[PDB]
Structure formats: C-alpha cells, structure tokens
Amino acid sequence: VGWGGSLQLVADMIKMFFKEDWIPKFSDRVIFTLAPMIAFTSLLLAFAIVPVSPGWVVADLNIGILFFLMMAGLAVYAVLFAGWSSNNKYSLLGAMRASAQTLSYEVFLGLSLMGVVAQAGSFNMTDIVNSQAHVWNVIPQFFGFITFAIAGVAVCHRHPFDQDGYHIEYSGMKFGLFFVGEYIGIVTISALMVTLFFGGWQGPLLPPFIWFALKTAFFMMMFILIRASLPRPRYDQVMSFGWKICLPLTLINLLVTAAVIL
Amino acid sequence: AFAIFLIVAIGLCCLMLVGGWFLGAKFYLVAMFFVIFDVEALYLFAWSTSIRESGWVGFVEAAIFIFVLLAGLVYLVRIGALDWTP
Amino acid sequence: MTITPQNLIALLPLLIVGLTVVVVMLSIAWRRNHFLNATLSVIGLNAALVSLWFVGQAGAMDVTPLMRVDGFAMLYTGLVLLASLATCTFAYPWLEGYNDNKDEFYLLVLIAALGGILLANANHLASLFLGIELISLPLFGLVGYAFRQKRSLEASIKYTILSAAASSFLLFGMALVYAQSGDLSFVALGKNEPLLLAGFGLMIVGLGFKLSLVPFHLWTPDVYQGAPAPVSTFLATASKIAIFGVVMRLFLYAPVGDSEAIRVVLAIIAFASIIFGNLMALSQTNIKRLLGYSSISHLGYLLVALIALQTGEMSMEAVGVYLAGYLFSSLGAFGVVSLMSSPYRGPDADSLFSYRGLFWHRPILAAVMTVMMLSLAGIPMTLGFIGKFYVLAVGVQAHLWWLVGAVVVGSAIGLYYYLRVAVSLYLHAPNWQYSAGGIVVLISALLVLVLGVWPQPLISIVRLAMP
Amino acid sequence: MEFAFYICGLIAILATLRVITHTNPVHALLYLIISLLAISGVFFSLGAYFAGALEIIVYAGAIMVLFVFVVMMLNLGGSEIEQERQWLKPQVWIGPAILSAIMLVVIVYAILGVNDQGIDGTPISAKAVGITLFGPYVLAVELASMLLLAGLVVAFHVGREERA
Amino acid sequence: MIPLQHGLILAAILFVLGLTGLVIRRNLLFMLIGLEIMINASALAFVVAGSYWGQTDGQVMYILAISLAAAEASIGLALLLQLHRRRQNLNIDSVSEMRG
C-alpha cells in the first residue's frame, strides 16, 4: 500500500475504477448522468472564489459571497435527482427527507454570513481579506461563526447522520464521484470558514500562504474530528432545534453587528 | 480568471466522461417555508452590502422588516405548522 | 428624502393597519380565538378611520417618490376601510358554523386593506404594483377559504391563474413604457411614439382584468358564485374601488393619456362593457352571478366618466360620488345574501328561484335588498341615480354621444333584471353579531335613501376631498 | 459580452421552446433551469450584477426546488401520457400560435421603429441597489414583506394538514 | 454594445413563449410553469430597461417582481395539493363547474 496516510485515499480511488455501469430500466438517463455532477461540480466551483493568496485568487469577479450561496442552493438538486432516478419508495421518501433537512439548514448559512459582510461592508473576497489586516472576523461573530459551522456540516456532510439509502443505487464510478465531491465539499467549507471568518494570507512570522493553509487543514481535520465525536440525533429533533433556535440567532446577531458598526 | 477556470473545469469534466466510457408524503410545507424565507432574507442581503451609508434610517427600516419576519416565524412555530416533519 | 413627522402623520393609515396585522398574528399564535381576533381586527380598522382625521390635519404632500398623498386619496382610503369593516362584520356570522381554523380570515382581510390603502396613495408605477398584489394575495386565498366545497377551490384556482396572468401583463407593459421614458413616475412619464403607446395598452390589459372590463370579464361570474358571501362583499366593493383610483390618477397626471390614441381605445372598452354586461345579465337566476354581472356594467359607467376627465373638472367629483353610491348599494345587497347564510351550511343555496317570498320570512331584510336593488338601477330617491346623473352630465359635457347613449340604453336593458329580483321578494312563500350584521345593512339602507332624496352633504364631502 | 449575450439569449429562447413543447415534466423542469441559468447569464451580459446572482439563489434555487418537490410527491410519472399527447396535435398547436403571432410582430414592428442608441457595458453593483432600495424605495421593502407574509398564511391554509 | 431592441426582443419573445405555453397545455402544473416563464420575461424587460439608462431602477423592483412570483408559486402549488387530494385527475377541466 501507500506510505502516506492521505495517499491511502488514492489507493481507494484505484480500487474504485474499472467497475462497469449498469443502466436501470424504466428510469431516466439525463439525471442519471447529471445528478453526480451537481453534487461534485457545484461545490468544485465553490472554490472559484477562494483567495489562497492575492496573487493566486481563482477569480476576481465583482461579487464573491453570493457565488458561494448560489452553489449552496444547487446542492439540493443532486439529492433530489438521485432519489427520482432510484425509482424506489424506500429511496423516494428518504430522498425527500434528506432534501428537506438540506433545505432546513440551508436557511441559516446566508443570514449568518451577512454579519461578516456587514462588518466588512462588502461581498468581494479581496475586500474581505484586506479587512482582516489586524483583527479577524471571528471575535465579534461568535454566533455567526457557530451557526455557519452547523449549516456547513448539515449540507451534504452526514453530520446529523440519518442518511434512506438514496445513494445506494449508484455503485460504479459515480459512487467515487459522490465521494470525491463530498471530500471537495468539506475542504471548501473549511476553506471558506477560514478565508471569510479568519484571516487568509496573514503570516506574522512565516509565509502567509502557508500560515493560512495550515488553518485550513485544522478546520478540515476538526470537522472530521467532530464527525466522529457527536452521535446521531433524532431526525424529528433537528427540525425541532432548527428554525426555533437558529433563525432568530442570525437575525439578532445581525442587529448586534448593526449596532456595533453604527 | 473565471472564464479560463470554468473552461478548464468543463474540459476536465468532459475528459473524465471520456475516460468513463472508455474504461467500461405530506408535510413538505416546511420546504415552502424556506421558499418564503429565502426571498424575505434576500432584502437583508442587499442591506448589509451598504449598511454604513443608509445609516440609521435604513437600520430602523431593517429592524421593522425582520420584526415582521420574526413575528411570522413565531406564528408558524406556535400554530404547529413548523414541527417534526416528513 | 428622509422620514419627517409630517411623513409619518401622512402615512398613518398604512401604519395603523400594519400594526394591526402584527397584533392579530401574535394574538392568533397566542390563543387562536375567533372572538378576540374579530375584536382586534375591527378595532384596528376603526382606528384607521379615526386616524383619517389626523392625516386631514396634514396637507397635500409626498411621502416618498413612490407615493403622493392628496385629499383625493383620503376619500378612497375611507371607501376601502368601510368595505373592510363591512366584510368582517359579515364574516363572523358565516364563519361561526365553520368547522376549524376560523381565525385566518381577519388576517387576510387586513392584508387586503393594506393593499387597498396603498393604491389610494400612488405617484410611481411601482406603488401601483405593490398595491395590486398586496390585495390579490388575500383574494387569491380568501375565495379559497373554506375549500371543503367543490366550487370554492374551483373558484380560487380560476381566479389564481387569471390574476397572476394579469399581473404578468401589467408588469411587462410597465417596463415597455419605461424603455422610452427615463422614469416610471406617473408625472415624469410621457416627457406619441408607438412603444410607449404599446406599453400602455399592455397595462390596460393588466388593469382591466381586475376592473372587470369587456374582454376580461369572464372571471366575475364564476368566482362570485364560488366564493363565500363575506368574501364577495370585499371582492365586489373594496378591490375595484381601490383599483379605480390608481387607474384614474395615471391618466390625470400622465401627459400620454391626454392623447386621443388611448382615449378611443378606452371608450370602445367602456361602450362594450355596458353592452356586454347588460345583455348577458338578463337570463341569470342566481343572485351571486346576478351581482357579478352588474359589476361589469357599473365599472363601465365609471369609464365613460373617466374618458372625459380631461374635458371639464366635473369628472373628478362624478367618479367620486358614483363610487360612494356604488359602495353602499353593493354592501347592502351582498350583506343580505350573506345574512341569509347565518350558519356556514356547507354550500349556501342562493338563487333567484330560491328568493321567492322572503318578505313573509324576514320583512326588514327584504326591504333592504329592494332598496339597494332599486338603487343599482337608476330609480330616483336613491344615491345611484345622482351618480348616474353626473356620468350622463360628464358625457354630455365632453360630447361623447355614443357613450352617453350606451348608458341610457344600457340602463334601459338593465332595468329588467333588477326589477324581477325586487318583485320576487314579494311572491308567495315556497346571535348578537348577527344582529350586528343586520344593523350594518340597515344602516346602509337609511344612508342610501337619505342621500338619494337629499344629496348635497355627500357632494360637500367630495368637493372637500378633491384637489 | 456581445457573443455572451447572444449565446445566453438563444439558449434561453430555445430552452423555452423545449419547456412549452416537451411532455415529461421533469425534463420540462430541467430545461427551465437551463433557461434560468441562461437568464442570469443575460443579466451578467447586460451588467445587472445583483440580478444574475440573485436569480440563481432564489429563482433557479428556491422557487424551482418547490416545483421539483411537488412533481415527485404526486408520483404522477407513468400516468396521463397517451391522451395528453393526443390532445396536442400539431394542427391544434398551430392555432393559438397564430394568435400569439399577431401581438409578437406588432411588438417587433413597434420596437423596430425606434433608433438604435446602443448602450455600453455599464456595471451596476449591489453597493447602490441596497442604498436605493432602503432610500427612496423604503416603503416598497416593508410592503413587499407583507406580500410574502400573506403568501405564508394562504400557503399554510390551502396546504392544510389532516389525518392522512 | 447591445441595443434596446435586441434585449427587449428577447423579453418579448419569452413572454409570448410563456403565455403560449400556459394556454395550450391541459395540466394545471404546466399552467403554473407558464406563469413563471412569463413573470421572468416581464422582469427581463425591466432589467434591460433599467440598465439602458444606467441607474438602479431595474434591481429595485426586479426583487418585487420575483417576490410576487414566489408568493404566486407557493399558493399555486398548494392549490394543486388540494386538487389532487380531492380528485386524481389534474387537468383544469376537472374543476370547471357552473358552465356558461
């Protein structure tokens, strides 16, 4: 096997290829070929706005944050189209239930990020990372920080468990495609949590680019750490402690920031 | 830039497709709550973009906006529409 | 401009009603009680009528570029508020027999009052859109209130698709005008190239659905048969009363409405509205479809005044008084229809053949329907005649001979069905808020009689309001 | 932006022909999302920056999720295909199209009558739209909120729950 | 550069294609789809109209236009719930009583 811990992932990828793909009868084909891409490619293009360095930001397009939220919306269409292509009632209601949870916890992420936008006063990601020159936006938005963390681990990240059998129907190269996509998904949430809340490109005594990527891994690892730590809640209970205690939190946090800024 | 990166991404997608075929109910209404509340909070997305120069009048304006929204959420919770759901 | 206390006193109608929605919604979530919600909603609408005096302390002025507050808007806000007051008092006796969730009704009527009192105050094309849709969403949903019947849902769905369709025509027209003009403000508009006129015709389509004009009148029978009679009180009176104010203000302010190209098209619509209303209205044996047929003809008489708004200043008060008379006549008639359904009764059985007798059953209520039904026609001693008389005078003043002749022959045709219902209440027979509902229609009967025989005090109010 | 504007318009024009023509509702939903991403490309071709992103968050990402939910929970696939295509004969399809043709060409003639006066690529950012919305258009936002809240009440009422 | 007529022609065509779709097709679901196809076409005219003159007059009620669309779509889907729950046919001729 490989001599690196992460290189074993590559080994798995090799153990993933050269399996044939069977076409289920009386099932759609366009979603069968595209529903993998919406779980993979959409969060891959959520990395098109990450300033790892001001000389190596992917795209200097005029609005940054919205282009994160856009992709975070298209994240629900993949869960649905897989469920409609499965054409099984055991999977149909599970896809509905999984997509309902994604829609429930997609609400908090946009309203939590507006507080960081308001203290920075802009959307564009270069304007943010020049705002974190001396103080990062993790001291003031503690409530915005924890809710963005909860909203990130709810969308296509299996942290509330309850995942049914809707990805069972794909087992060929598309199973690795969903797996590659969720790995890509977790690194962009960790990267965006660092570069929007913390400071990317800081480097007090070491190259800043290294100093940032170091924090990126810490969150990425930390998400895995908490994934293995917190047990499964009841699927009834996550909606009970969703809109009740999370939607008021971002709005009252946004008013606290509006009083602080003004 | 963005267009070059998008072209690179879609070319990689086409290449992996080439390699792939070469190798060989009820109570959904919580969903509709989202659909209202996204468009409700989209006005807040505009406001925090320029909170500073709208100033206190925009702040008083935005406070009444989200108080209406928060009153609606309490109505939804306390009616019994927003609870455990399929 | 910013917010000054003059602006808040001017905005006081839109404010009291909005505070009422919040308090009503909190009260619904607290207790879910019919008595408390009815009391809270009617108190807010009565508080809005009281605060009309306070905005009368303020002069003719702007709040934002979206709105202009004049004394014209003071009277139209008052018409909408009494219709909202009228519909809640007619809904309590109908909803006492409803099986469950009896409390969402006042919340939707309160939203519709916000929409009505927002189309009274208009100065920009966007306020026109925020008002039309604020009132439609309760009218989207309240004709579908009590969807347990097989026709309420039918009526709601037909009105839903068609009203969204009209709003899409209005919005597409609203932009095609703004392509030429640099601003969408009514005054700033028109500062006769075909795109502006073509955009104007699209807004006529989107406005003439809700005003029930001749090629758009198809919804007015069906939903009026399907909707609850408390909803029909609001759908007949408040919506079109509020909507007619904004369509009149657009032609008064905009210099494009001065041109004869739009004038000829609106006159032909008015001509055909009278004719295509009053001929198909004869054969009906249903009272709700009968009132819905008459609504098309009444909005046509309003248009034959509006076409001569630009010739002589008497058209302002003419439109105002016919709207006041039309409010009182329809509220009394539709209140008696709803007052016959004192329980929910599932589907109410109301028809012209079902209204044989009704004088030896309930004599007072038959008198109210007869007085109002003679007031709809043009019989004197009733306020409808004075309103009819000004629209004839306006058409004579502006030399619209075909249009004034259409009103007379339309009156001649339309006398027939009003008189059958008046005499059909004299053939041989085949709780506390109910007494309150009787008081509302009986109060309106006294008012239409005394303002038909003695019409000067209502004119003094109208010339007080007109700028 | 000119070739970009042209390609997004033709994709929107064509995908709209497909969604009024096709029969499978999920394919119709898919083609209309192509239409909505095409329209956001049109907005970014024109320069409306707070519209192209705004349309994808909400119009291609909130409203159409609700459309997709209802078409999978009715489970209406496999029923009402044969007679539904028997209703749409091409001779029937021609009929009302000539009706829509009359207004479409009048609009084309009415818009061809004016001069060109071609605009440039003016970029309109969200910095001033949030200012303008909470300044002169202050009333619109609050009243706009009531449009949504009213939709909430009626959608809970018509989407009333029961024992089933 | 793109002139007014090219943009507005895109708007006009889309509205006509929308309107046409709703009229021709039987199912209430496709009528709702046609409503959304024609409410965005009107909004498409507004943005190109509002971006002709180069100010914030498009995006200031493009949002109101989609707020109406969101509210209409929510109630329209709710109406079809009750319609299939009462009767399994989904065509609009099912609820077509009181003819003439």
Tab-separated table of C-alpha atoms in Angstrom, chain C residues 13 50 73 122 177 189 251 253 273 353 374 402 430 445:
chain	number	residue	atom	x	y	z
C	13	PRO	CA	-53.387	54.803	7.537
C	50	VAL	CA	-60.124	57.688	13.274
C	73	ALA	CA	-56.595	59.663	-1.530
C	122	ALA	CA	-49.857	56.488	-5.708
C	177	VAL	CA	-43.167	52.173	-21.250
C	189	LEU	CA	-43.916	59.655	-17.667
C	251	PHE	CA	-54.449	59.271	-16.817
C	253	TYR	CA	-51.109	63.031	-14.338
C	273	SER	CA	-68.568	46.827	-21.204
C	353	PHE	CA	-85.821	30.980	-7.714
C	374	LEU	CA	-83.591	49.788	-6.967
C	402	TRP	CA	-72.367	57.200	-28.392
C	430	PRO	CA	-92.329	28.219	-1.119
C	445	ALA	CA	-80.360	51.368	3.729
